[PDB]
Amino acid sequence: ENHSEIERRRRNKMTAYITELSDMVPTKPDKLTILRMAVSHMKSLRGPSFLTDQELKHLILEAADGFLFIVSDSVTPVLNQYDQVHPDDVDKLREQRSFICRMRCHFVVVHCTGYIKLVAIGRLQTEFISRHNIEGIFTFVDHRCVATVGYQPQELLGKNIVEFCHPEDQQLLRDSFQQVVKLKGQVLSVMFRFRSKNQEWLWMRTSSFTFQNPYSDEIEYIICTNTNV
Amino acid sequence: EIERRRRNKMTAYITELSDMVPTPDKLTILRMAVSHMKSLPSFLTDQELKHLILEAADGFLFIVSCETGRVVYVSDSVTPVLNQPQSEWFGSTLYDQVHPDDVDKLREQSFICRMFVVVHCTGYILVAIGRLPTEFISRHNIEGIFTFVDHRCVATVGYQPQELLGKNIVEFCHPEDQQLLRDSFQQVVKLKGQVLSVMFRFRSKNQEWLWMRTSSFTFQNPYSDEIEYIICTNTN
Amino acid sequence: RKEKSRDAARSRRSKESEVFYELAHQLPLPHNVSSHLDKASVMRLTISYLRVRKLLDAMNCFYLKALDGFVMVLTDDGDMIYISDNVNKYMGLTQFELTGHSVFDFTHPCDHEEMREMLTHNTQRSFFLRMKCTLTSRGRTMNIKSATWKVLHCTGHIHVYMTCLVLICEPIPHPSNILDSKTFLSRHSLDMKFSYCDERITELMGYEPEELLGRSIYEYYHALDSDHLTKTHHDMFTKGQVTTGQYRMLAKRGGYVWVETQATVIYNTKNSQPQCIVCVNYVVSGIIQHDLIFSLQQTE
Amino acid sequence: RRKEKSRDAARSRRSKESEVFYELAHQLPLPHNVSSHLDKASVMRLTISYLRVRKLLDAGDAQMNCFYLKALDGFVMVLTDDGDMIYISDNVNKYMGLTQFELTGHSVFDFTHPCDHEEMREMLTHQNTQRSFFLRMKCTLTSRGRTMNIKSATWKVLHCTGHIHVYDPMTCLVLICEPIPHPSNITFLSRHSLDMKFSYCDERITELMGYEPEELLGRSIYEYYHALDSDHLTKTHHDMFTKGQVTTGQYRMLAKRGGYVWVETQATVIYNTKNSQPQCIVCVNYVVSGIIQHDLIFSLQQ
DNA sequence: AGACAGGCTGTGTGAGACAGCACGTAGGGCCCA
DNA sequence: TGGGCCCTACGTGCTGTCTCACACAGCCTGTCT
Q1: Do A53-123 and A127-228 fold alike per CATH?
Q2: CATH for the A127-228 domain, from 3.30.450.20, 3.40.50.1950, 3.20.20.10, 1.20.58.220
Q3: Number of structural domains chain C divides into
Q4: CA distance C229 to C216
Q5: Same domain, D175 and D193
Q6: Nucleotides of F under 7 A from a protein CB
């Protein structure tokens, strides 16, 4: 039954391809007629590679927004256009094959790959976020906090958020932090009062969820995004 | 390299047989193996295979005649599973040993029946083997109208389900905290499947505020990712 | 000297081959098979046999035939140390072609991780495994070069003696190659919404199949069993065929009915892309607590 | 008499079929010596693929063009909703090993790792059209450049970038799969542990940002990534664990005395050949910018 | 302690069995009468 | 209402390939002088 099945498999393999070709050509007929009409279509289309260089470049610039430079016309639709690169990257360009740097478009990054013959192409590739430890000591603060609470990031590092909170809510904040650590990655939203530099109390929401290692699932820190409403 | 991996496999097999013999040269190790073979056509006997079947699944063997439905013979393995003895099964039928609702179901008959505990019965024509509130769940749509509440909500908030369906949680929420619940719902909508927790106040059947903390995450479609509803776990 | 060394090599192979020849005789195998076995196969068979004997020592025949599956044994390392002789009925691979081989050699590459998690050591297990199958729909055998995949519902318990897992693998019947009063058939689209139903649905719960088309099924599921059903439906998408555990799915006028579903994805013979999902929902129980209402749909 | 007449009539058609297929085999734009040895099924497959590509191209409206193939560091694929490589650039053998005439027309779900079928299906289905994901493709090319039998071929990871085309509806996806260079067979280099702590850093790290490598060993890097790239890098690390070779996006690495630097990570896992399990994770990082906003402190370590 | 015979290992060669490709042969409908 | 033409499924022949063991040369070790 091994050989018979293969012949059945091959015939169905051939039969399906017979059907597919007939649908492919606009111009059901018999098999011999199908192949003869296909040969006629090929003879019409024969005027040794599957695609031409123009078609290949069309496919390349449709798949990836790239241009050829040693320049091609496709620079304008994408870039809107040593001197053309970043002043700090001139040393990297001189020694340079594959390199990623910034070129003139306000700077944009350009990914270039090629070989030395140099021929290469260029293909285009109210809330603040802060980090706390398992107990809430500030580990990282983003620039967006200066417009949120007014405190500079330096003055917030090393001090627990609970001390920055109202004394009445300190028990609820501790309970929420324990909950966040226990849930293992489920975000928790808590409404509380955040003191500003001017000591003015602002209503704040906290979205704190534990961050685990992708492999070992070890608690690295808690990501805390805060929105003022 | 193909030949190398064969000898590596062969040497590993040689090493493997070295440990398993109760009591060097390859020829002598094979001689010890075959001597043990002489001391020691199926790999298992009937009883060994029966023991393996019993260990693999908490199941039992029973046979009932199709002509009348009377019980002919049952195995001793029915007692550890169904907690019933063989004497009661002997001299009886299968109809009275099953749920009354499934009496007609088995008449037509690989079928599923409950004896209650569900018993997954498989066999061929008859030989066969029988094989074995402080929080409430709720649903919401995008806008937050109650689409489903389990009967546990009676034990949690005191309301019957009919008094919560069709009324949005925000309307049911306190006017002071109305904005927070809307913010939380928008948050879980845009988080796309991240479990989120929010504490608020819930008005019970006797109109007194009580603390309530929920866990909501949007049910995305496993294929088209369309939001089906929101599941909330309200813990009191 | 060198010729004597050459003769010693031939002499040592003579005793090397003679022990292999007689070793296969002692194994409880057919003589037409035992004499034709190579060294690697006989060594694997002997190792596996000895492992089964060590495991065991540390109306009866109807137990195997009654089951619609084959008992399967795995070690902590994945050795297929024992397979019941009725494997050829389902996968077509004979027992002698399977015994002793690593389970990771006869499993789809995406089920290796589930295998590792399930073997590692509650003791109960229940998982779906894509094991190689060499049977066509007409029962013909076929070599490994064109073997197809089949999903097996594996249930068993890990035991600690050396620790091995005893499994019973069962096939999921193809609904197109198979339905009493208490069981019905239905077909859904890719996005898991009702697209066709059997005429037996109405007497079970009161549903009219006319308005079911276009509505998602997830509304009708109970809220408690949403996560388990989501995991099982994801397994259906990944592996192709699942048998969902018992769940509650709401009726029209109230209550719930316990329903077990054996979903089955359908692929076109031309595109090899998913087309539709066929589910043979088994209704086991009638409506419980009819007077209670649960969802907005039940209100209408 | 009815039996013998049919055989002559039946043999007549087969003779006519072979010349028609030979004519069709010759009509394919291939060398003449290749078309002669090509069996019927391969002729059918290549003709169908060529016709589909021609239909797609005709629906879409000088010596510099020929340089694209060798300059571009990948090989162009075209995939339809069916999953057929209706066109592959002739330089597939240089990067992937397999030869164009063997691959063209075959199913893409066959010549890739079986565990990337789901990702392929999700990316092929069809509102942004950009696609960027990693696909494990079967490789028959050995590290020394020897072509080796396909029946024992090993998997290779490719970084796929492309668009979905809806052409008048029939949909094609045009992929440019690029190889990930193994760091042992080739800006600073580094090396990390399997659960991602630092285990080695190149001495070039000192000049770029002031970090001293001896301080870095033993400390997890997740405290050094900016908080705005945590989920992106987590997804990339999940790709690392699942496949073995991945490439990051543009993310921020914190400096010593202030600011951050934009780096790109081309990280590959290395397996111990003795036991065939992951041992270490090797990363190669591309620094592309200096310290930005050094005047402010963002982290406790800074 | 160094040399000799014996045991253990790495690489190339030969052959029975099997998978692929293609053709001769007979079994069903096709539209006609 | 009269059997011919033609389309399609199956066994067989030939060829290339797969996997197994056989044999030889080299490395490591016990033993004798």
Answers
A1: yes
A2: 3.30.450.20
A3: 2
A4: 14
A5: no
A6: 5-13, 18-25
Amino acid identity, residue A126? T
Q: Which residue of D has its CA nearest to A98?
A: D73
The structure tokens listed for D296 are: 């402010």
* CATH architecture type of domain A2-45: Irregular (4.10)
- H-helix or E-strand spanning residue D56: helix D40-58
Is residue C51 assigned to a domain?
no
Kindly list the distances between the CA atom of residue A147 and the CA atoms of A143, A165, A198, B131, in Å, as whole numbers in the listed order: 8, 18, 13, 65
Choosing among 3.40.47.10, 3.30.420.40, 3.40.50.150, 3.30.450.20, the CATH entry for B135-235 is 3.30.450.20
Q: Are residues C148 and C185 in the same domain?
A: no
Place of tokens 């086991």: C284
The CA-based dihedral angle spanning residues D36, D37, D40, D41, taken in that order and rounded to the nearest 10 degrees: -130
Listed by start position, the domains of chain A span 2-45, 53-123, 127-228
Neighbours of chain B (3+ CB pairs under 8 A): A, C
Residue pair B186/B158 in contact (Cβ under 8 Å)? The answer is no
What span, in angstroms and rounded, lies between the C-alpha atoms of A38 and A47? Answer: 15
Q: What is the token pair recorded at A15?
A: 């039969």
CA dist., res. C164 & res. C156, Å (int): 11
**Contact check, Cβ <8 Å, C272/D109:** yes
Best of A4, A5, A8 to substitute, by most chain C Cβ atoms within 10 angstroms, is A5
Q: To which residue do tokens 């392929």 refer?
A: D120
* Chain C 69-88, residues with CB within 8 Å of chain B CB atoms: 71, 73, 82, 84-85
Experimental method: cryo-EM
Tokens of D151: 């029946």
Q: Please identify which residue in the block is written with the tokens 């073995």.
A: D244
Q: Where are the beta strands (DSSP E) in A7-106?
A: 66-69, 98-104
Strand partners, C276: C266
Q: What is the DSSP letter of C76?
A: S
- Candidates A46, A54, A109; nearest CB to D27: A46
Distance from C-alpha of C244 to C-alpha of C279, rounded to nearest angstrom: 10
CATH code for the domain in which residue C138 is found: 3.30.450.20
Given resolution (angstroms): 3.9
Tell me the C-alpha distance between B156 and B154, whole Å: 5
* Residues whose CB is below 7 A of strand F: A 3-4, 7-8, 11, 15, 30-32; B 2-3, 6; C 2, 6, 9-10, 13, 17, 38-40; D 5-6, 9-10, 13, 149, 151
> Residue D93 CA to F22 C1' — how many Å?
38
Task: Kindly state which CATH superfamily the domain A53-123 is placed in.
Answer: PAS domain (3.30.450.20)
| Distance (Å) from the alpha carbon of C19 to chain A's nearest alpha carbon | 34
Final residue belonging to a domain, choices C125, C145, C171: C171
Q: Does A5 touch chain C (CB under 8 A)?
A: yes
| Domain that residue D256 falls in | 187-287
Are A188 and B197 a contacting pair at CB < 8 A?
Answer: yes
For chain C, the distance separating the N- and C-terminal CA atoms, rounded to the nearest angstrom, is: 100
CA-CA distances (angstroms) from residue D190 to D216, D253, D260, D263, D285?
11, 14, 18, 13, 7
Query: Is any atom of strand E within 7 angstroms of residue B38's beta carbon?
Result: no
CB atoms within 10 A of CB D158: 24
The answer to whether B73 and C59 are in contact (CB under 8 A) is: yes
Instruction: Calculate the alpha carbon distances from C98 to C58, C103, C245, C285 in Å.
Output: 24, 9, 30, 41
When computed from its CA atoms, the radius of gyration of chain D, rounded to whole angstroms, is 25
Q: How far is CA B106 from the centre of its chain?
A: 24
In angstroms, the CA B193 to CA B190 distance is 9
Task: Note the CATH architecture for domain B46-131.
Answer: 2-Layer Sandwich (3.30)
Q: How far is CA C188 from CA C169, C185, C211, in A?
A: 27, 10, 14
